[PDB]
Design a protein around this ligand. Structure first.
Ligand code: G98
Lengths: 20, 344
């Protein structure tokens, strides 16, 4: 499932802008 | 079938522009000092600063204060962006925007004092509950559509739409925050900035872009509110961008047909075919099936009952925010970057 893959990726937390 | 509310919106926006230009021309500077506020707790952190809860000592009112390290802003090439942020903030006025109350600077830092929104970030609420229902998502999406209609009429691009930057007030309505990447742009602009998941294809491909990137981010936001995860994700940014530019999106099986149709029109990789950027402009979105039950005036007037109201424990309560490590704000004996921030 796409939900489990989302939880498996490292990007469920607060996301920073790239900045620059 | 009486859309002379169109003429009313047109009249409203013409007036909003007058007000904006008046303030844009004569911007407020240095309206407060650092020791008029009591620093209480960190609400959020970044590469070049932080945001704290503060208490205005005379009045007793709580505010959020953004503190930017001038040296770090220069180091990270954000000087122009911080001047945009302040200048835009002081000139705008809309029900779903956080309000700038004071700004000032000292030897080491820039300071922007603004409304505290005690309900926290949409991000935290969405990650905890998993996903919002379509009515719940639609409630917020309607506010963002009106907000972009306002901002774009004034030639402002926001450029950092995401759940992290949408705070929820005591009545369940959205307060958009972080104008760090907001810019006044007639025609094209070129800076590679934003959050990877929310970057439009034009930005990624370095070709020059316009207000349409915000309508794209809206597609990504509605998707994430309704799905519980974003339409393009991967472990690393590079893989995310490849997905964004591919022209391929998959929708949860539980998405309605109307929502899927809206999102295909918002997530069009070719900006000339994207909702918000066609001949009818924002009206393509407002008149779309998915928003058929939306009372746009009542939402602007805040007369719609919110589907969710955060827990309120009092003024100065921060339980809707995460905890961040605290650091003493030090002000140097010598002025840093005086020329770079002379306009601030
Ligand atoms: C902590 C949550 N937060 C709030 C809150 C309010 N107004 N009430 O509660 N929290 N306002 C934030 C504003 C703002 C603003 C204005 C409107 C002045 O433009 N920028 C935030 O961004 C952070 C994180 C990355 N963007 C940041 C921090 C330091 C340096 C660079 C970025 C976070 C913010």
């Amino acid at each position: 499932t796409t939900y489990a893959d989302f939880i498996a990726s490292g990007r469920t937390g607060r996301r920073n802008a790239i900045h620059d | 079938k009486k859309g002379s509310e169109q003429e009313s919106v047109k009249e409203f926006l013409a007036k909003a522009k007058e007000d904006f230009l008046k303030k844009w021309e004569n911007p407020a500077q240095n309206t407060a000092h650092l020791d008029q506020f009591e620093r209480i707790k960190t609400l959020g952190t970044g590469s070049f600063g932080r945001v704290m809860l503060v208490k205005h000592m005379e009045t007793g009112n709580h505010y959020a204060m953004k503190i930017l390290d001038k040296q770090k802003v220069v180091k990270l090439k954000q000087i122009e962006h911080t001047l945009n942020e302040k200048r835009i903030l002081q000139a705008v006025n809309f029900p779903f925007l956080v309000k700038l109350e004071f700004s000032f600077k000292d030897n080491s830092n820039l300071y922007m004092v603004m409304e505290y929104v005690p309900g926290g970030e949409m991000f935290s609420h969405l990650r905890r509950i998993g996903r919002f229902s379509e009515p719940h998502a639609r409630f917020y999406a309607a506010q963002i559509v009106l907000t972009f209609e306002y901002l774009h009429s004034l030639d402002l691009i926001y450029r950092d739409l995401k759940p992290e930057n949408l705070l929820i007030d005591q009545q369940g309505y959205i307060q958009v925050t972080d104008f760090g990447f907001a810019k006044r742009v007639k025609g094209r602009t070129w800076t590679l900035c934003g959050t990877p998941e929310y970057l439009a294809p034009e930005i990624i491909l370095s070709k020059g872009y316009n207000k349409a990137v915000d309508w794209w981010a809206l597609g990504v936001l509605i998707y994430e509110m309704a799905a519980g995860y974003p339409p393009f994700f991967a472990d690393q940014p590079i893989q995310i961008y490849e997905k964004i530019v591919s022209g391929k999106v998959r929708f949860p099986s539980h998405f309605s047909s109307d929502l899927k149709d809206l999102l295909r029109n918002l997530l069009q990789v070719d900006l000339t075919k994207r909702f918000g950027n066609l001949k009818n402009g924002v009206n393509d979105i407002k008149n779309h099936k998915w928003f058929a039950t939306t009372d746009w005036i009542a939402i602007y007037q805040r007369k719609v009952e919110a589907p969710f109201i955060p827990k309120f424990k009092g003024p100065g309560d921060t339980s809707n925010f995460d905890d961040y490590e605290e650091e003493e704000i030090r002000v140097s004996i010598n002025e840093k970057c005086g020329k770079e921030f002379s306009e601030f």
